[PDB]
Amino acid sequence: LDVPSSSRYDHRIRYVTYNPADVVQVDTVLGVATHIMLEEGEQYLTHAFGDSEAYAFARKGRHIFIKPQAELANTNLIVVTDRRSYKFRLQMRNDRNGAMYELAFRYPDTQARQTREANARAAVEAAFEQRVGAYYNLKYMMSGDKDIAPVNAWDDGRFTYFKFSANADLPSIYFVDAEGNESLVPRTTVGSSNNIIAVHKVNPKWMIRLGNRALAIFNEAYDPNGVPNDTGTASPAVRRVNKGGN
Amino acid sequence: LDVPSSSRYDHRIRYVTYNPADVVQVDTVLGVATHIMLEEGEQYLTHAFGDSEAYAFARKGRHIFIKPQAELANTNLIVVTDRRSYKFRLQMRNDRNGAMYELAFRYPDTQARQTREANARAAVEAAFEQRVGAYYNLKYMMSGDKDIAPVNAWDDGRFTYFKFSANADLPSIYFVDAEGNESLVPRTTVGSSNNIIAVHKVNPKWMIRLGNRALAIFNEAYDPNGVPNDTGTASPAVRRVNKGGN
């Protein structure tokens, strides 16, 4: 039977630590309005009194107002929401002293959940950025309209990164087959200043165009073997699991 | 008679295991409303009191709310649901002590049935993956545009597989007749990294096509006899049964 902890400024405002296995005692004096604040995003279902005529009930959303309107009111409340169900043990105060104006709940369960999943993205982001155990190949030739040349090009065995100077206009890249036929390849843009364009394929050829200017890129050490994407993520450290179930 | 055991924090919150061979004892006092929680997703049909007037029953979803309105509230509750029916012995307590603020069920039946189904599915999956009594043929041959050829090819006597280097595009595979015509064949992609393509016929000849480039795969040890598929599924250790009867 948790008694809510008094606010340091005034005992008339009380905080209590929520628990699905305990019932909180509510002290109500004659003629005051008892304020219940629900945590954000609780969808109210319904409640129940020990005496519907003993206490006055008004609710809109996450705010519940309780007020005794009949003498000698010793009943209880069971309020249910989509997430949880709060339980109270109401004792009518006989001396109009030790009044409690408002009750607020602390939810250690939500904190425990969110802190855990916060650590979840912590691990995910760390694994993504760490990218250790990856090799880089730099052997790349070039020919054509040199003015739109990428300042550097390299591949990580999965992608291929092209970079350009801050004054260089970002060109387009087209994936070249063995026969000389150009076809699209999905490009993603990364890098500090959007000076890195990454294409989602490794190919023994590439071609770069802009306006009526062209350029070819050769992979002098195209490794057809590569490393299988054993996890379906750009990293070898991010497992990809099927959430949907069913 | 099952009597629920209270929670360690409050004697009002009691937990109990459902059983169809006995009826829950509920010890209600005057001035309390009892919260009853059905199993998640359970579908209530109807209920029955000894006295419809003795207790009020308000229900929304899976939540049951009761409270005695008359003295000597000594009757029964028989609520029926789609999956089961719950039974209660509402006994009035004249001392207004030892309340029942709630009652939550720990179902053995649903998890007990779940474990069996999970066990059956596990046995099924183990039967598929174990894959014993399999002979393998590797005498495969190619000719043509080698640039998109598979790294490996083999048959288990039933299916023909092709493994492709993780950097290479996945090509389209066609069936070849003894005459020289081409026919679509169903393909399923298996393997850890989706680098193994499986076609559903063991055949002397195969053509692989992509873009403008083609490659013909030749089997040098096509065995017409094969293995009979008498169990109706890819495994020799799984049957297929006609459950529909009729």
Binding site: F49, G50, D51, S52, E53, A54, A70, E71, L72, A73, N74, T75 | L30, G31, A56, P68, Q69, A70, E71
Partner: peptide, 15 residues
Amino acid sequence: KTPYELARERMLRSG
């Protein structure tokens, strides 16, 4: 009609 009885009957008839 002692007030405790008032409380009891109001409790009973209430929903």
